[PDB]
Design a protein around this ligand. Structure first.
Ligand SMILES: CC(C)NC(=O)O[C@@H]1CC[C@H](c2cc(Nc3ccccn3)n[nH]2)C1
Lengths: 298, 272
């Protein structure tokens, strides 16, 4: 079963299970392994595991991290993934003084949206986009990882698990207690992360659901039935919220050309209906350089 | 041909095609019970009817149900020569995988053993779930018979902003159609017809080939076969009168139509 693989070094143990970097002895093939201890489980193979497997089976794309095999031995399951060296937070951290080249920001954001555009058209939400779950290789690629909190959406979506997404990267519709939800939650994550990449500092580091909303508001402006129909009737909306003026985006992310600063605003529209899509983001002038259009049959 | 409106998140044709391309990769064989020569059709029927009952009592999702069916019928066509005794375990193992997949708060392993009245214990189920999952090759994301009916019902209520995400459609009509499919599935010859069409077919029986077409895309011809095959099963639903949407105080309201249900259907499948 596992006889060709030499654990070289462990790279992480969190909400994912265990994860060691492996060697293929005969090949010099470097993969990532996720170990799942089956014995420990009362409830058999975890819910989160059965999902992340069958999804990644049918989510083959260059900006998604690739599942390569599934191996069962001795009351231990092994997921075997395409391997990348660094994660986008430790990178963003390493380049906290120097800045990140805007060439590379743009390039990276692009590749993420292609991954997301792929998932969404495959009718799948990530629901835990965060620099920790964005992996970069040495050839300048970036790729979505960690589909444990992902979930397909029956095109007429139904009610999904309320509390998802790490607080900071979490979208105002989930915080204000929205019933149904869809693709626009992933975009807000990516928008937080764009701004992160620019300012090498998280856009909304809330220490609570209350702090997170207020931190958002202080930057985007206390929202009303104008900028976001429904907002006022929504469950965790209180008429008590203070009022803050939206701010100039030239201050909130100073380094960013109008082409960026626009894009970002549409990614952080309050109204999920109006929020930009993955596919449409690719169209934006910001990618004028990497944008190369095609024709359109009617 | 795609009956989806101009989508915002992706290319309506792109989305529909992926969905279609999916219903290939996912394969079924109406005549798989010949590889198990000692196995009879009328068996499969009673098992599926059992699973429904259990799905009801635990307020499981129809979707969960159909994931069970699908895991069963796909798995068996990877197997050879199986005994009637084994089928109680293979079905409720199937369901367990689904429940884990579809519910937020799925039932616990013992409750799943429980129902077997000893004949299957949690440890057996845990072994099975793994032979099944390695035998479908971890392909547990099929578009289900009911999955389509939800699509079609949503596409039947367009309004102005062609919003295909917020479910906006009447429960009693959904329930009434489900009832017809939830039968049709008991006879193995349905695997002949793709789930797209079975769902179309049934909707036509409660509507017309004009709605069917604007919701599904399928042309009167594409279905005629299964609407011919399905005729018998329709009469019986019509003869008895069609069901009232019930409420289960566990379950909210804007989900009550999605909760799987039961009625003898023994007497009813026979009448074809
Ligand atoms: C966020 C991640 C730890 N969790 C996760 O679910 O990732 C997937 C499963 C493992 C696979 C994977 C890891 C990997 N190396 C690295 C290198 C640096 C940082 C994190 N991981 N390369 N590929 C992808």
């Amino acid at each position: 079963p596992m006889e060709n693989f030499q654990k070289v070094e462990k790279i992480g143990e969190g909400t994912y299970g265990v994860v060691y970097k492996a060697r293929n002895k005969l090949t010099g093939e470097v993969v990532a392994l996720k170990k799942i201890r089956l014995d420990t489980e009362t409830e058999g193979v975890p819910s989160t595991a059965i999902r992340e497997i069958s999804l990644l089976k049918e989510l083959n794309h260059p900006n998604i991290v690739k599942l390569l095999d599934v191996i069962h031995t001795e009351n231990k399951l092994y997921l075997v993934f395409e391997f990348l060296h660094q994660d986008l937070k430790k990178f963003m951290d390493a380049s906290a003084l120097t800045g990140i080249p805007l060439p590379l920001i743009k390039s990276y954001l692009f590749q993420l949206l292609q991954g997301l555009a792929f998932c969404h058209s495959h009718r799948v939400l990530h629901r835990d986009l965060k620099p920790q779950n964005l992996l970069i290789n040495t050839e300048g690629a970036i790729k979505l990882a960690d589909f444990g909190l992902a979930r397909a959406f029956g095109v007429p979506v139904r009610t999904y698990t309320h509390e998802v997404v790490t607080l900071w990267y979490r979208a105002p519709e989930i915080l204000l207690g929205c019933k149904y939800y869809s693709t626009a939650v992933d975009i807000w994550s990516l928008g937080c992360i764009f701004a992160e990449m620019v300012t090498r500092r998280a856009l909304f580091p809330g220490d609570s659901e209350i702090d997170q909303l207020f931190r958002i508001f202080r930057t985007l402006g206390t929202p009303d039935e104008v900028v976001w129909p429904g907002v006022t009737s929504m469950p965790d909306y209180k008429p008590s919220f203070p009022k803050w003026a939206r701010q100039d985006f030239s201050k909130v992310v100073p380094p960013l050309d109008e082409d960026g600063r626009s894009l970002l605003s549409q990614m952080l529209h309050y109204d999920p209906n109006k929020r930009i899509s993955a596919k449409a983001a690719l169209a934006h002038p910001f990618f004028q350089d990497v944008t190369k259009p095609v024709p359109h049959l009617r | 041909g795609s009956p989806l409106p101009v989508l915002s998140w992706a290319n309506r044709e792109e989305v529909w095609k992926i969905m279609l391309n999916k219903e290939k990769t996912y394969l079924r064989d109406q005549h798989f019970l010949e590889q198990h020569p000692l196995l009879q059709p009328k068996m499969r029927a009673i098992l599926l009817d059992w699973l429904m009952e259990v799905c009801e009592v635990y307020k499981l999702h129809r979707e969960t149900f159909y994931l069970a069916q699908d895991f069963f019928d796909r798995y068996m066509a990877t197997q050879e020569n199986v005994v009637k005794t084994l089928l109680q375990l293979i079905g409720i193992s199937s369901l367990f995988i689904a429940a884990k997949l579809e519910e937020i708060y799925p039932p616990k392993l013992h409750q799943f053993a429980y129902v077997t009245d000893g004949a299957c214990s949690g440890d057996e189920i845990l072994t099975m779930e793994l032979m099944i999952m390695k035998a479908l090759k971890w392909r547990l994301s099929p578009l289900t018979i009911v999955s389509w009916l939800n699509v079609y019902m949503q596409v039947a209520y367009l309004n102005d902003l062609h919003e295909v995400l917020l479910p906006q459609y009447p429960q009693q009509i959904f329930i009434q159609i489900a009832e017809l499919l939830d039968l049709c599935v008991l006879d193995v010859d349905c695997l002949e017809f793709p789930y797209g069409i079975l769902a179309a077919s049934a909707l036509y029986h409660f509507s017309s080939s004009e709605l069917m077409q604007k919701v599904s895309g399928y042309q009167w011809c594409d279905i005629e076969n299964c609407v011919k095959w399905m005729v018998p099963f329709a009469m019986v639903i019509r003869e008895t009168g069609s069901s009232k949407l019930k409420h289960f105080r566990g379950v909210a309201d804007e989900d009550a139509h999605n909760i799987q249900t039961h009625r003898d259907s023994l007497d009813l499948l026979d009448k074809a």
